[PDB]
Amino acid sequence: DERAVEALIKALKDPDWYVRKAAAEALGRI
Amino acid sequence: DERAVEALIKALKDPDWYVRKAAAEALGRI
Amino acid sequence: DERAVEALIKALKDPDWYVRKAAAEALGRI
Amino acid sequence: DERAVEALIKALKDPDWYVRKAAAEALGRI
Amino acid sequence: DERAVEALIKALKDPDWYVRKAAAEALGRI
Amino acid sequence: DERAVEALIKALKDPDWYVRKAAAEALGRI
Amino acid sequence: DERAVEALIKALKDPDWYVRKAAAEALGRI
Amino acid sequence: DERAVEALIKALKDPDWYVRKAAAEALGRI
Amino acid sequence: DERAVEALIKALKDPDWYVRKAAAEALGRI
Amino acid sequence: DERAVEALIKALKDPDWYVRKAAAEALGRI
Amino acid sequence: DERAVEALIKALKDPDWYVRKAAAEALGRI
Amino acid sequence: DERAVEALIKALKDPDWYVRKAAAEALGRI
Amino acid sequence: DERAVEALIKALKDPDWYVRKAAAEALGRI
Amino acid sequence: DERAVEALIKALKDPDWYVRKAAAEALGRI
Amino acid sequence: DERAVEALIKALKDPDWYVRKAAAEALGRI
Amino acid sequence: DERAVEALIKALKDPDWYVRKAAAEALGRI
Amino acid sequence: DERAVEALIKALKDPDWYVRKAAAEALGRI
Amino acid sequence: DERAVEALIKALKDPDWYVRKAAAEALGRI
Amino acid sequence: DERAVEALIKALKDPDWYVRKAAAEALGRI
Amino acid sequence: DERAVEALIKALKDPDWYVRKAAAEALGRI
Amino acid sequence: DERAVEALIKALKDPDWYVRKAAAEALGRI
Amino acid sequence: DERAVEALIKALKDPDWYVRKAAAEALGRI
Amino acid sequence: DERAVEALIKALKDPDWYVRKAAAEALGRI
Amino acid sequence: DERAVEALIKALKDPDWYVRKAAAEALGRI
Amino acid sequence: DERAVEALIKALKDPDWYVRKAAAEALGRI
Amino acid sequence: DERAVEALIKALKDPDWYVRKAAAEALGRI
Amino acid sequence: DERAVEALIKALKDPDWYVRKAAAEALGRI
Amino acid sequence: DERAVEALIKALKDPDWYVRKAAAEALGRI
Amino acid sequence: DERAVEALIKALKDPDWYVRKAAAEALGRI
Amino acid sequence: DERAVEALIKALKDPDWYVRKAAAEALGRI
Amino acid sequence: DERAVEALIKALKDPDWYVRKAAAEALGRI
Amino acid sequence: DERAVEALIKALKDPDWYVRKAAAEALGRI
Amino acid sequence: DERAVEALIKALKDPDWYVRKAAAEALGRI
Amino acid sequence: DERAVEALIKALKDPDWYVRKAAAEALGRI
Amino acid sequence: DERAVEALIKALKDPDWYVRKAAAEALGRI
Amino acid sequence: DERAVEALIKALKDPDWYVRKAAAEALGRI
Amino acid sequence: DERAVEALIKALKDPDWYVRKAAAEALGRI
Amino acid sequence: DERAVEALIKALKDPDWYVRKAAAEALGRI
Amino acid sequence: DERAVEALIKALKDPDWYVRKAAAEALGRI
Amino acid sequence: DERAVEALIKALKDPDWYVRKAAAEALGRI
Amino acid sequence: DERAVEALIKALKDPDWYVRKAAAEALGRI
Amino acid sequence: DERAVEALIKALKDPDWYVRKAAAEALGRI
Amino acid sequence: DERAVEALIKALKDPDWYVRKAAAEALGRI
Amino acid sequence: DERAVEALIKALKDPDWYVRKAAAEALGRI
Amino acid sequence: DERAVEALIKALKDPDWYVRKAAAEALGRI
Amino acid sequence: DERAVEALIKALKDPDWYVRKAAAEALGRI
Amino acid sequence: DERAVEALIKALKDPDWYVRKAAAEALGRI
Amino acid sequence: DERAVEALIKALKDPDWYVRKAAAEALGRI
Amino acid sequence: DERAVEALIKALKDPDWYVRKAAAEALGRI
Amino acid sequence: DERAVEALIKALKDPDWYVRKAAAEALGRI
Amino acid sequence: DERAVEALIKALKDPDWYVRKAAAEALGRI
Amino acid sequence: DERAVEALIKALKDPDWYVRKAAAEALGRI
């Protein structure tokens, strides 16, 4: 479920992983 | 989801103001 | 919940943090 | 689908941070 | 939310007229 | 509540503050 | 809200005809 | 209340004040 | 509101045929 | 009331006054 | 309103066939 | 009343008067 | 109205098949 | 009355009269 | 109306299968 | 009456007559 | 109608499985 | 009667006949 | 069903197979 | 269609990873 | 029906037949 | 149309793989 | 109707007639 | 229009394969 | 109406009349 | 407009095949 | 109205008047 | 505007065929 | 309003005034 | 703006035909 | 507002002031 | 902006006709 | 904001400062 | 950005008229 | 962010540094 | 990217005014 | 990502390496 | 591609400053 | 894919092979 | 095409460094 | 298709055949 | 055209290496 | 159509016919 | 034009190889 | 039309008529 | 113009082969 | 119009009038 | 200009064949 | 305007005035 | 400029045929 | 402006002043 | 520049006809 968001928060680890960037993108949807 | 909002508020309390920015943005979607 | 808004008000701290900017964006939704 | 989200969260736990990026992106769609 | 409006009115009382602008804008959304 | 409108009227102070402008925008919604 | 309308009518009585314009516009929304 | 309309009629004073224009706009809603 | 209509009919009797136009338009909305 | 319609009929005087045009518009609603 | 219809029928008897057109159109709305 | 319809039938006189056209429009409602 | 239908049937008997078309169309509405 | 339908059947004479077409339209309602 | 249906069935017996099509369509409405 | 349905079954003769198609449409209602 | 259903069941026994499809569809409506 | 359902079960023979598909549609009503 | 997603996760094997790339594309939809 | 998805998952199991790519792409559309 | 997809999978035989290519194109829609 | 799809699948069975290509392409549109 | 498609399949006879080409174009729409 | 399609199919049967090309093209539009 | 198409088919007489060409152009729209 | 089409078809019957060309072209627009 | 088209047909008099040419241009729009 | 068209048709009746050309051109725009 | 067009028709007086030319230009827009 | 058009028509009545040219040109834009 | 146009008309005073020229340019936009 | 236009009109009233030229030009942009 | 325009008007001081020239350029955008 | 405009206006107040030129130019872009 | 502009204003220090020149260039974009 | 702008502003603070020039230029692109 | 820019800033080391020059070129794009 | 950028940044770290030049240039394209 | 770039980096081996030169050229595109 | 790129990378692995040069050049185009 | 490229790679056999040269030329396009 | 490419590849297989040169050149165009 | 290319291949017969040369020229376009 | 190409191919079959040369050349243009 | 080409083929009769030469020239365009 | 081409083809039929040469040349331009 | 061409054909009368020569020149443009 | 062409055609009818030469030449330019 | 051409035709009076010659020169442009 | 042309035409009416020559020449430029 | 031309016409006073000659030169540009 | 032209016209009014010559020459450049 939307706990994915809190997983996005952990995905906000690294925007040279772009897992943040993808998370910020996902937060750019969510 | 409300807890997700609460986590996003904690993401607005996240020492990395980068996160706070992303958190606010996510709360913009919400 | 929408107490996030008041967290956005605190996020209005800094638009060279863009946490304001993201907050203003979030207020640009809310 | 929620289990799919759960798997995508596990994809956010995927040792290949490439996957985490894709997973976050997928969760962006969702 | 009404208290949120009340806070936004206090944001229209916020010494930083920048905030008042953002507050009015937020109240525009609302 | 909608007393915000009357706060918008006070926000009509200054459109080089754009707090008027934002108020007129808010009145452009309200 | 009706008192808000009454205030907006007083905003149509506001010496700054700029306000009257904004007030009429707001009453257009309403 | 809708006595605002009759205030719009008085706001029809001046469309280089645009208080008429805003009134005609408001009548363009009302 | 009916009196408002009556006033708008008087606005259709308004020596400024500009007003009559606006009045008819307003009655179009109504 | 809808006697406004018969006032629109008198407003059909002049479509270079556009009071007809506005009347025809109002009849374009009514 | 029925008398209004009767007047609109008289507007369909109006020597200006322009009016008859507008009258028919109004009766289209009705 | 709906005798207007039979007046529309007489209004079907002329679609370069468009009183027919408006009648056909009115019959396009009726 | 039924007599109106009867007239519209007579409009389906109207030597101008243009009318019959309009009559059928009107009966389509009805 | 609905004998109009049987008049539509006779109106099905000609769809280059479109009295059929209008009849088929009327049967497209009826 | 049932006789109308009976006529429409006869319209399904109408040598012009065009009519039968229209008749079936009309019976679709019914 | 609904014996029309069984007439639709006979109308299911031909969908290059579209009397079937219209019948299937009528069965698409019935 | 029940006999109509019985006929539609016979239409589900109709050698043309096209009909059976239409019959089932008709029974879907019913 | 609803024995049609059991005929739908036999109509579940073939969804490249779509007699199943139509049956599933009919069961999508029933 | 959406278990395809988890098949996309296995398709994330290889983006010189582009089965990942196509999976990331599919996750770029999903 | 879900079986189609299941086949596409089998196409993600297709020894030709070319197919898997196309399959993933198709599942992207879906 | 969408079994065409599985026919596209068989059409994925040959992209120097371009029947794969056309299939991949079709999967580029589907 | 589904039979058309079935024919297009037979066109994917058409000995001329040129046709299969065109058939797949057509199914791409569909 | 869409049996035209199967006529396009026969039109796939000859792309030095370009009746295939036009058919492939038509299938490039259909 | 369907008869128009039927004629266009006959135009695909037109001895001048030039016409068939144009017919297919027209059916491409349709 | 679209019987014009069949008139275009007759207009396909002659593309040194360009009445075909114009017809093919018209079929290049239709 | 349909009569306009009918006239354009008569323009496709116009002894000057120049007109027929223009008529077909006009019907191309339509 | 579009009777202008039939006036264009009369304007097709002369393309050294270019009233045809302008008509063909107008038909190049219409 | 239709009267404008009527005037433009009269401009197609204007003794100066120069005007007719311009009129046709204007009707091309319309 | 578009009575300007009829003023353009009077402006078609003189294309060594270029008031025609400008009118033809204006008709080259209108 | 319509009054602006009316003024531009008066500019088409402006004794300086230079103005009329400019006025027509302006009405070309409009 | 567009009363600027009427100011352009006064600006049409002088094209050795080029205030006309600039006005004609402005009318070359307006 | 309208006040800006009003100022530009005052710039068309600016004793330096150089300004009027620039003002008209600016109003050309607007 | 666009008060910059009125600052451009003051910048119209001097085109051997080219602050006018740049202003006229800016008005050449604005 | 508006503050940026305000700064650019201050750049139009910049003692170096060189800057004012650049500022006006920048405001030209904006 | 666009505070860069105000940094360009400080970069307007020196056009024998060309940091002004580059700033004026940047203002030649901004 | 905004941090990139911030770095470019720091590049406008770069002791080598060569860099400041390049930085301003880069900000010109941005 | 655009951190490349900050790498360009380090590449601004040396324009007899032309790594600055290439960086300035890259900033001449960025 | 971002990893490609990362590699190009490593190419800006490439001991051969020749490469750094080429890398910066490539990043100029990007 | 763009891993070609990293192959270009290896192609940066030798510009008396000109495989660097061609790589720098390719980077002169990429 | 990506496989083509892969082959071109293998052409960058081609023992003839002449080919590698051509391959890099081809990848420059791509 | 682009397998031609790999045929160009085989065409890179011989630049005293110039089939390489033509291939390098073709790669000078591709 | 792809078959044309295939033929051109066969022209790259043409025993006359002259042809291969021309074929490669043609594929250069393509 | 482009089968002309394969006719060019046959035209590659003879460059003392220059039908090859013209073909190579044509391939120098194609 | 394609038939023109077909004729030009026949011109490549023209016993005068002079023509074939010209034909190939013409196909070069095409 | 382009049948002129086939007339050029007949014009290829004679290049001491230069009607071939002019044809080859025309084919040197076509 | 096509008739002009037709005349030029007749000029290719002009007994004076001088004309045919000029005609072909003219068709070269066209 | 281009009937001038046919006048050029008559101008092909005489190239010791050079009216042919000028015509051939004009055809050397046309 | 077309009338100019018409005059130039009359100049091709000018008894002085000198003029015809000049006229043809002028039409060459046109 | 281009009536100058017809003035050139009158200027074709005399090429020992060279007003013809200058006219022929002007026609050598026109 | 057109008036300039008109003056140049008057210069073609200038009693000094020297001027007419110069005027024609000037019109040659134009 | 181009009124200079008419000043050139007055400059055509004297070609032993060469102010004509210079004017004719200027007309040799204009 | 236009004022420059105006000055050059005054230079065509310069008592020294030498200047007028130079002025005309300068206007020749312009």
CSV table of N, CA, C and O in Angstrom, one decimal, chain n:
chain,number,residue,atom,x,y,z
n,1,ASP,N,18.4,1.6,-34.6
n,1,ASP,CA,18.4,0.2,-34.1
n,1,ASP,C,19.5,-0.1,-33.2
n,1,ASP,O,20.7,0.2,-33.5
n,2,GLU,N,19.2,-0.8,-32.2
n,2,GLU,CA,20.0,-1.1,-31.0
n,2,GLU,C,21.0,-2.2,-31.3
n,2,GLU,O,22.2,-2.1,-31.0
n,3,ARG,N,20.5,-3.3,-31.9
n,3,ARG,CA,21.4,-4.4,-32.3
n,3,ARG,C,22.4,-3.9,-33.3
n,3,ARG,O,23.6,-4.3,-33.3
n,4,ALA,N,21.9,-3.0,-34.2
n,4,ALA,CA,22.9,-2.4,-35.1
n,4,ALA,C,24.0,-1.6,-34.3
n,4,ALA,O,25.1,-1.8,-34.7
n,5,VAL,N,23.6,-0.9,-33.3
n,5,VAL,CA,24.6,-0.3,-32.4
n,5,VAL,C,25.5,-1.4,-31.8
n,5,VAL,O,26.7,-1.2,-31.8
n,6,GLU,N,24.9,-2.5,-31.3
n,6,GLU,CA,25.7,-3.6,-30.8
n,6,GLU,C,26.7,-4.1,-31.8
n,6,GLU,O,27.9,-4.3,-31.5
n,7,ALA,N,26.3,-4.3,-33.1
n,7,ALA,CA,27.2,-4.7,-34.1
n,7,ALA,C,28.2,-3.6,-34.4
n,7,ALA,O,29.4,-3.9,-34.6
n,8,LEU,N,27.8,-2.3,-34.3
n,8,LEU,CA,28.8,-1.2,-34.5
n,8,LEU,C,29.8,-1.2,-33.4
n,8,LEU,O,30.9,-0.8,-33.6
n,9,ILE,N,29.4,-1.6,-32.2
n,9,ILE,CA,30.3,-1.7,-31.1
n,9,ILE,C,31.3,-2.9,-31.4
n,9,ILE,O,32.5,-2.8,-31.1
n,10,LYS,N,30.7,-4.0,-31.9
n,10,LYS,CA,31.6,-5.0,-32.4
n,10,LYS,C,32.5,-4.6,-33.5
n,10,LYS,O,33.6,-5.0,-33.7
n,11,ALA,N,32.0,-3.6,-34.3
n,11,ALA,CA,32.8,-3.0,-35.3
n,11,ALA,C,33.8,-2.1,-34.7
n,11,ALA,O,34.9,-1.9,-35.2
n,12,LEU,N,33.6,-1.6,-33.5
n,12,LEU,CA,34.6,-0.9,-32.7
n,12,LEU,C,35.5,-2.0,-32.1
n,12,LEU,O,36.6,-1.6,-31.6
n,13,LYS,N,35.1,-3.2,-32.0
n,13,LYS,CA,36.0,-4.3,-31.7
n,13,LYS,C,36.6,-5.0,-32.9
n,13,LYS,O,37.3,-6.1,-32.8
n,14,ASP,N,36.5,-4.4,-34.1
n,14,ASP,CA,36.9,-5.1,-35.3
n,14,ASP,C,38.4,-4.9,-35.5
n,14,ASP,O,38.9,-3.8,-35.6
n,15,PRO,N,39.2,-6.1,-35.6
n,15,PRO,CA,40.7,-6.0,-35.7
n,15,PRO,C,41.3,-4.9,-36.6
n,15,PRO,O,42.3,-4.4,-36.3
n,16,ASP,N,40.6,-4.7,-37.7
n,16,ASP,CA,40.9,-3.6,-38.6
n,16,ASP,C,40.5,-2.3,-37.9
n,16,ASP,O,39.3,-1.9,-37.9
n,17,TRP,N,41.4,-1.5,-37.3
n,17,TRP,CA,41.1,-0.2,-36.7
n,17,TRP,C,40.5,0.8,-37.7
n,17,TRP,O,39.9,1.7,-37.3
n,18,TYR,N,40.8,0.5,-39.0
n,18,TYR,CA,40.0,1.2,-40.0
n,18,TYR,C,38.5,1.1,-39.7
n,18,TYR,O,37.8,2.1,-39.8
n,19,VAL,N,38.0,-0.1,-39.4
n,19,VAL,CA,36.6,-0.3,-39.2
n,19,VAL,C,36.1,0.4,-38.0
n,19,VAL,O,35.1,1.0,-38.0
n,20,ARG,N,36.9,0.3,-36.9
n,20,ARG,CA,36.6,1.0,-35.7
n,20,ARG,C,36.4,2.4,-35.9
n,20,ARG,O,35.4,3.0,-35.4
n,21,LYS,N,37.2,3.0,-36.7
n,21,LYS,CA,37.1,4.4,-37.1
n,21,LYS,C,35.7,4.6,-37.8
n,21,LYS,O,34.9,5.5,-37.5
n,22,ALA,N,35.4,3.8,-38.8
n,22,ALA,CA,34.1,3.9,-39.5
n,22,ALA,C,33.0,3.6,-38.6
n,22,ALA,O,31.9,4.3,-38.7
n,23,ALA,N,33.2,2.7,-37.7
n,23,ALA,CA,32.1,2.3,-36.7
n,23,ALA,C,31.8,3.5,-35.8
n,23,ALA,O,30.7,3.8,-35.6
n,24,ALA,N,32.9,4.1,-35.2
n,24,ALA,CA,32.7,5.3,-34.4
n,24,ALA,C,32.0,6.4,-35.2
n,24,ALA,O,31.1,7.0,-34.7
n,25,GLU,N,32.4,6.6,-36.4
n,25,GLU,CA,31.8,7.6,-37.3
n,25,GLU,C,30.3,7.3,-37.4
n,25,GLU,O,29.5,8.2,-37.3
n,26,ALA,N,30.0,6.0,-37.7
n,26,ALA,CA,28.6,5.6,-37.8
n,26,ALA,C,27.8,5.9,-36.6
n,26,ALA,O,26.7,6.4,-36.6
n,27,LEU,N,28.5,5.6,-35.4
n,27,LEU,CA,27.9,5.9,-34.1
n,27,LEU,C,27.8,7.3,-33.9
n,27,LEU,O,26.9,7.8,-33.1
n,28,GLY,N,28.7,8.1,-34.5
n,28,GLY,CA,28.5,9.6,-34.5
n,28,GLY,C,27.2,10.0,-35.1
n,28,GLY,O,26.5,10.8,-34.6
n,29,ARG,N,26.9,9.4,-36.3
n,29,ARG,CA,25.6,9.7,-36.9
n,29,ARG,C,24.5,9.3,-36.0
n,29,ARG,O,23.4,10.0,-35.9
n,30,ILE,N,24.6,8.2,-35.3
n,30,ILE,CA,23.6,7.7,-34.3
n,30,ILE,C,24.0,8.2,-33.0
n,30,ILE,O,24.5,9.4,-32.8
